[PDB]
Amino acid sequence: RHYKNLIERQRY
DSSP states (O other): OOOOOOHHHOOO
């Protein structure tokens, strides 16, 4: 269901 990592990390 995709990897939200993309944001999950940019917000870190």
